C-alpha cells in the first residue's frame, strides 16, 4: 500500500502481549543493545527529546524481541507526549498486561527478590503521570490550548497582581490570564468536552486496573499512585467545570 496517515502505526496490544517464544516468553534482556541505547538517547532532553522515535522503537522491541518494563514505561510516557490522554491510557493498559502475563519473566528480572527495585521505573511513572495529566488541555480555541497547570498559574497571577499592582506588567508577561483561558474555553467545542471527559474516565479505569494488578503481584512493594490520583481528581473536576460552563450536560 501507501504510507498510513498519522504519526505512528497502531500499537496493537494483542501483539504486544504475545510471548516472544514459548521457550523464552520475554526474550533476552536488551539493555546493552544498540537499539536500547538509541531509545535512551531519544528520550534525553535538557538536546530535545524525539518522542516519535521512542514510540516506534520501544514498540518495535516489545513486539519483536523482548518484554521489558523499562521500555513499557518509556512507551507510556512517549505516547502521552505524542497523543495526549489516550496515549497515557493505552500505556497503562500495556503495563497492566505485562504484569498479568509476564510477571515471572519480564526484564529486568528480580535480584535478591528486591521487587521494589524491579518496579522503580513504575514508581517514577506515578510522579511523571501527575505532570502529564496537569498538561492535558482543558480548552482548544482562540489559537491556544490551556491546561490545569495553566489555570492554576492564571489564578496565581491574578492574586499576585491584586497584592502587587505596581509590578502587574512583569507578573503577567508570558503567563496565561483568567480572561484568556475563559475566551479560549468559550470557543471550544462541545465535541472537545465529550471526548475529554470520556478519555479521562477511561484513564481512571486503566489506572485502577493497573494498581489492582500491582497489589496482587507486588503486595507491600507496590509503588504508590497517590500523586497521579490526586492530579487526576484536580484535572477531572476542572474539566467537568469547563464542560458545564460551555453547555455540556
Ligand atoms: Ca516528531
Ligand atoms: Ca516503594
Author numbering: -7 to 38, 52 to 254
Sentences from the paper on this structure:
Contractile bacteriophages of the family Myoviridae (i.e. T4), R-type pyocins and the type VI secretion system (T6SS) of Gram-negative bacteria are evolutionarily related nano-scale injection machines that puncture target cell membranes using a shared contraction mechanism. TssA subunits are enigmatic as they possess a conserved N-terminal region of unknown function, previously identified as ImpA_N (PFAM: PF0681226), whereas sequences located C-terminal to this region are highly divergent. Consistent with this, phylogenetic analysis has suggested that the TssA family can be subdivided into three clades (TssA1, TssA2 and TssA3). The structural studies presented here show that TssA1B, TssA2A and TssA2B possess structurally diverse CTDs that lead to distinct overall architectures for their respective complexes.
SEC and two-hybrid analysis of the overexpressed Bc TssA1B Nt1 domain indicated that it is monomeric. Analysis of the crystal structure of the TssA1B Nt1 domain, determined to 1.80 Å, revealed a monomer composed of 11 α-helices that are organised into two subdomains, an N-terminal subdomain 1 (Sd1) connected to a larger subdomain 2 (Sd2). Sd1 (M1-P113) is comprised of five antiparallel α-helices (α1–α5) and contains the ImpA_N1 (L8-I31) and the ImpA_N2 (D55–P113) motifs. Sd2 of Bc TssA1B (L114-Q251) contains six α-helices (α6–α11), of which the three longest (α6, α10 and α11) form a five-helix bundle with α4–α5 of Sd1. Residues from ImpA_N3 (R123–R133) form the start of α6, a helix which includes a sharp kink between L124 and G125. The C-terminal helix of Sd2 (α11) terminates at Q251 and is thereafter followed by the connecting interdomain linker to the CTD. The sequence conservation in the ImpA_N region across the TssA clades implies that all Nt1 domains are closely related and adopt a similar fold, which includes the entirety of Sd1, and the N-terminal part of the first helix of Sd2 of Bc TssA1B. Mapping of the 34 conserved residues in the ImpA_N region onto the structure of Nt1, shows that approximately two-thirds are involved in packing interactions in the core, with the remainder located predominantly at one end of the molecule in the loops between helices α1–α2, α3–α4, and α5–α6.
